[PDB]
């Protein structure tokens, strides 16, 4: 039992190091994403041209379909309804 | 992409000959399916 607990504690140390590696790298990726967003904002006329929490977990083709479906339902024809079914 | 080109490659591959177009499509399919260590491109005018 002490052998099992020692080996499982070493496995938990390796898993905590992996979670920290994921987090560090993940944080760096998030920072890069923020910079990209800032660049997009800079690139961004706009003045003349001027549900979500469930759509946070959609697949990207499903997310594009959901955005286009809500845009077409609010834009031209109001006889359209969408719903997200799953777990 | 630093933090697309496939559409430009499709607009270029519109003008390919049919055996070259079949080779392009099958090569992209085999590169996305199994072996990611493969790259294709179209050279010409």
């Amino acid at each position: 039992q002490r052998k099992r607990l020692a080996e499982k504690y070493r496995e938990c140390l390796s898993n905590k190091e992996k979670i920290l590696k994921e987090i560090e790298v993940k944080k760096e990726y998030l920072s890069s994403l923020q910079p990209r967003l800032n660049s997009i904002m800079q690139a961004s006329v706009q003045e003349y041209l001027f549900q979500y929490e469930t759509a946070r977990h959609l697949p990207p083709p499903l997310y594009v379909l959901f955005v286009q479906a809500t845009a077409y339902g609010q834009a031209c024809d109001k006889t359209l309804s969408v719903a997200i079914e799953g777990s | 992409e630093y933090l697309d080109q496939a559409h430009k490659q499709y607009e270029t591959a519109r003008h390919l000959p049919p055996p070259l177009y079949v080779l392009f499509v099958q090569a992209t399919a085999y590169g996305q399916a199994c072996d990611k260590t493969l790259s294709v491109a179209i050279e010409g005018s």
């Binding site: 987090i23 993940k26 944080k27 997310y63 594009v64 | -």
Partner: peptide, 28 residues
């Protein structure tokens, strides 16, 4: 998991922006 969900939301937003740019290029 929260960082991965935020990164997946940013990737889905970038894909939706690319799809909107493709639809604008197809319409014009």
């Amino acid at each position: 998991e929260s960082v991965e969900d935020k990164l997946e939301l940013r990737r889905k937003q970038f894909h939706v922006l690319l799809s909107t740019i493709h639809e604008l290029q197809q319409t014009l």
